[PDB]
Design a protein around this ligand. Structure first.
Ligand code: CX9
Ligand code: CX9
Length: 376
């Protein structure tokens, strides 16, 4: 009745010490679907991007030896990849055919159950206005190629899903919603990075509701507005998967006296010692900041925590907020949750003392998957 899809990222293997995350570190009972971020593209054909991806594929797909019900997908693209290869590949029926062929081959060789398109985004970041409809032709042709292939080798069809924008403007220039909804098996809405230091004020990574002071287009940046937009504009509730972040965005406060939602900021907060990402802390990095005596806040209107100390402020998600969001999603009848990323939750259990994978476990309990079988 509910999916729990988890993203695994192939650069987490380079994090130091307790931060290193390999496919073997994934509990196979935890998620219903796991997505491998990312593959790339070369001459219109899907391709690996790390030296050891073939080894990681085997260990990632091998997790299906422990849980017969687990499905895995391979994600192509992502933010860093940009749009240029996608624009050239969709531009002709030949380029699309070359790609779709390379994908059926790749997925079957390395034993994935499907592809997740993570083009960020058709029609933006240099992608021309025609990519919006060409992304639809690609997805339809891919779905249809999957269908034919399932019939001429007699196995279950490969799956096609897509990670899709949460920003209204990116949505408008990127997606034929009703038409894409027919062909995609799931729609993973990136309901996070809704605020960050690029705005010049503090704000939440993934608030559920708007802030009472949010006006104009700032009223759109919350999970409620975003999911209802996708649903009202043609996507069936059951195909729509709400994105949950296991990390938060941090900021430098302009004045360490103003620590509220909306306080002015002078830039990204500092990289953490594990993920090393400017402006972002993994959930487990944030638990260190809390044990460092940071003041804990609760944004009550938006139902999400925040925290601060000296001139550093972070808005993020915890067990309380994941659970609230998860009851909310059940009530609104969405199909499930997607989590970026399994390697950013407290996977060793040692940073937060909330057990192993505290964030994702909350979602597992709340979406009633606690009883889901985990057998070969
Ligand atoms: C390919 N690669 C290698 N190292 C990388 C990346 C990378 O893409 N990103 C950007 C990932 C940005 N991103 C997504 O692409 C994405 N897609 C769905 N959700 C996502 N999120 C939260 C997200 O940060 C990196 O940060 N690093 C360190
Ligand atoms: C997911 N992401 C990763 N890097 C990004 C983005 C991004 O969405 N935007 C456009 C939207 C506003 N925004 C962000 O969402 C964002 N996320 C991380 N860093 C970001 N920046 C600098 C930013 O401007 C970016 O410009 N950059 C550099």
């Amino acid at each position: 009745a509910y999916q729990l899809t988890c993203y695994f990222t192939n650069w987490a293997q380079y994090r130091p010490g307790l931060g290193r995350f390999m496919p073997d570190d994934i509990n196979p009972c935890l998620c219903t679907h796991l997505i491998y971020a990312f593959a790339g593209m070369q001459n219109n054909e899907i391709t690996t991007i790390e030296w050891n991806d073939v080894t990681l594929y085997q260990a990632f797909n091998g997790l299906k030896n422990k849980n017969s019900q687990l499905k895995t997908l391979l994600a192509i693209g992502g933010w860093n990849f940009g749009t240029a290869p996608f624009t050239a590949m969709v531009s002709t029926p030949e380029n699309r055919q070359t790609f779709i062929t390379s994908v059926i081959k790749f997925l079957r060789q390395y034993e994935f159950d499907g592809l997740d398109f993570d083009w960020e985004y058709p029609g933006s970041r240099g992608s021309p206005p025609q990519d919006k409809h060409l992304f639809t032709v690609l997805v339809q042709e891919m779905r249809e190629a999957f269908e034919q292939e399932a019939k001429q080798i007699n196995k279950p069809r490969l799956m096609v899903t897509a990670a899709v924008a949460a920003g209204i403007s990116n949505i408008q220039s990127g997606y034929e919603i009703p038409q894409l909804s027919q062909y995609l098996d799931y729609i993973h809405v990136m309901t996070y990075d809704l605020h960050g230091s690029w705005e010049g004020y503090t704000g939440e990574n993934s608030p559920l509701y708007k802030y009472p002071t949010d006006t104009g287009s700032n009223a759109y940046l919350n999970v409620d507005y975003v999911m209802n937009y996708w649903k009202d504009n043609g996507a069936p509730a059951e195909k729509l998967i709400v994105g949950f972040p296991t990390y938060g965005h941090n900021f430098i406060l302009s004045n360490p006296s103003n620590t509220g939602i909306g306080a002015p900021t002078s830039g990204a907060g500092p990289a953490g010692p594990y993920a090393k990402e400017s402006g972002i802390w993994a959930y487990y990095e944030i638990c260190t900041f809390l044990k460092n005596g940071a003041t804990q806040g609760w944004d009550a209107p938006q139902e999400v925590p925040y925290a601060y100390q000296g001139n550093v402020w972070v808005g993020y998600d915890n067990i309380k907020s994941f659970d609230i969001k998860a009851q909310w999603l059940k009530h609104n009848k969405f199909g499930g949750a997607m989590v970026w990323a399994i390697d950013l939750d407290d996977f060793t259990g040692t940073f937060c003392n909330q057990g192993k994978f505290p964030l994702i476990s909350t979602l597992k309990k709340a979406l009633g998957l606690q009883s889901a079988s985990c057998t070969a």
